[PDB]
Amino acid sequence: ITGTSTVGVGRGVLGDQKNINTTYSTYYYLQDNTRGNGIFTYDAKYRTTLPGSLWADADNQFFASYDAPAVDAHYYAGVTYDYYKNVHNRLSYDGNNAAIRSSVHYSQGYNNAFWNGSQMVYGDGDGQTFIPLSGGIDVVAHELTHAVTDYTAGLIYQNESGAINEAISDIFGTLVEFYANKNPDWEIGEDVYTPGISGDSLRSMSDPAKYGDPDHYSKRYTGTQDNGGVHINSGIINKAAYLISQGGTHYGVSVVGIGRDKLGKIFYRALTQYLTPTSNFSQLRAAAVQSATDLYGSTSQEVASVKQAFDAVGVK
Ligand SMILES: N[C@@H](Cc1ccc(O)cc1)C(=O)O
Ligand SMILES: [Ca+2]
Ligand SMILES: [Ca+2]
Ligand SMILES: [Ca+2]
Ligand SMILES: [Ca+2]
Ligand SMILES: [Zn+2]
């Protein structure tokens, strides 16, 4: 909408108060004019028609329980934008300040979220398996990272290319969670998953096997479900990324950790300069080794640790 940039206040899904950038024209809309061509948040109103209505509020205060998912989708889209701009000099998901659009209250009791090619979409969950999924900063950043991948590598969403696509979204979702520095970890979706159970999540990058996902190539899923295992085989790559950052000994192979910033630089370089739509795990190792070589030198610790981590997960 055309209007005046304003700043509202509300509470997110987990009851945290935060300020949000809004636009005033009769109503206050969830439209942040301060980031690129805008961040826009919509109400799907329990239906599956997208995007739905640009979120409008009478008084610029967003404290209703119904508001909470909208507050978080809008706020965390902004944090993710900040991460890509400040850390990688990338302006929105296309690198050209594309408007970022999110819809909440998608369907009834919908236990998922997704990038649909155009925008991010968040279910409210059924209150048992999930609370509203925009409450998870790693979730929001995972989904917006699919947009980044769409505009860069374009990894096809099936088999090994799809598992890489999935891992890239887990890696940057997690790096954004660390950037924001609120209860960061190497797990995915812990903030919104199972409000009745402490300490669980959808996936673990540090120990994928904790939730039944492979941590070595020898254990890859070869079946047809989940598009050839894209959320399962991502464990292999996530494990490699965790090792490059944090280090450790995995199946008797030792990796010296080089830290999250360098992990981020190496995978962002691989994503934007070397990976293709059909890149497999072997080609990802090559891309990451070449990216570390470009940044640090063929004989650097960084290159060595990338090699070590891929060796540890059985990827040559
Ligand atoms: N996002 C993942 C994990 C997931 C699976 C089922 C859900 O109901 C929610 C999340 C997927 O779509 O496979
Ligand atoms: Ca209000
Ligand atoms: Ca966390
Ligand atoms: Ca997390
Ligand atoms: Ca839980
Ligand atoms: Zn995903």
What is the best residue among 231, 232, 238 to mutate for testing ligand 1's pocket, by most ligand atoms within 8 Å of CB? 231
Give the residue range(s) of CATH 3.10.170.10 domains in the chain.
6-154
- Which residue has tokens 């995007």? 51
Closest to 76 measured CA to CA, from 23, 150, 137, 160:
137
- The answer, yes or no, to whether any atom of ligand 1 lies below 6 A from the CB of 231, is yes
**Distance in angstroms between the alpha carbons of the first and the last residue of the chain:** 51
| Rg from Cα positions in the chain | 19
Hey, whose CA ends up nearest to atom 11 of ligand 1?
A: 231
Query: For residues 269 and 294, is the Cβ–Cβ distance under 8 A?
Result: yes
Reference 305, options 238, 252, 236, 259; nearest CA is 259
Q: Which two tokens stand for residue 264?
A: 């981020």
- The runs of H, that is alpha helices, within the chain are 68-88, 137-151, 159-180, 225-229, 234-246, 260-269, 281-296, 301-312
- Chain centroid to CA 7: 26
Active-site residues: which are they?
143, 231
Any atom of ligand 1 within 6 Å of the Cβ of 60: no
Domain 155-315 grouped into CATH 3.40.50.150? no
CATH 1.10.540.10 for the 6-154 domain, yes or no: no
Burial (Cβ within 10 Å: 0-12, 13-18, ≥19) of residue 157? middle
Do residues 221 and 214 touch, judged by C-beta distance below 8 A? Answer: yes
Q: What 3-state DSSP class applies to 231?
A: coil
Distance CA 142, CA 169 (A): 4
Distance 65 CA to ligand 5 centre (A): 20
Cα–Cα distance list, 11 to 20, 30, 67, 70, 260 (Å): 10, 14, 8, 10, 30
200 is in an annotated binding site: yes
Answer left, alpha or beta for residue 68, where phi above 0 means left and psi between -120 and 50 means alpha: alpha
CA dist., res. 212 & res. 203, Å (int): 9
* Cα-based distances in Å from 217 to 110, 194, 246: 32, 30, 20
Q: How many CB atoms lie within 10 A of CB 282?
A: 13
Is residue 190 annotated as involved in ligand binding? Answer: yes
- Give the whole-angstrom CA distance, residue 155 versus residue 245: 23
* Cα–Cα dist 161/93, whole Å: 19
* Dist. CA 100–CA 114, nearest whole Å: 14
Residues ≥6 apart with Cβ < 8 Å to 177: 137, 138, 141, 184, 185
How was this model experimentally determined? X-ray
| Encoded tokens for 67 | 């508001």
CA dist 52 and 106 (Å) reads 9
Here the tokens at position 116 are: 């649909």
- Please check if 142 is assigned to a binding site: yes
Q: How far apart are CA 277 and CA 156, in angstroms?
A: 5
Residues 248, 121: Cα–Cα separation, whole Å: 36
Domain with CATH 1.10.390.10 in the chain: 155-315
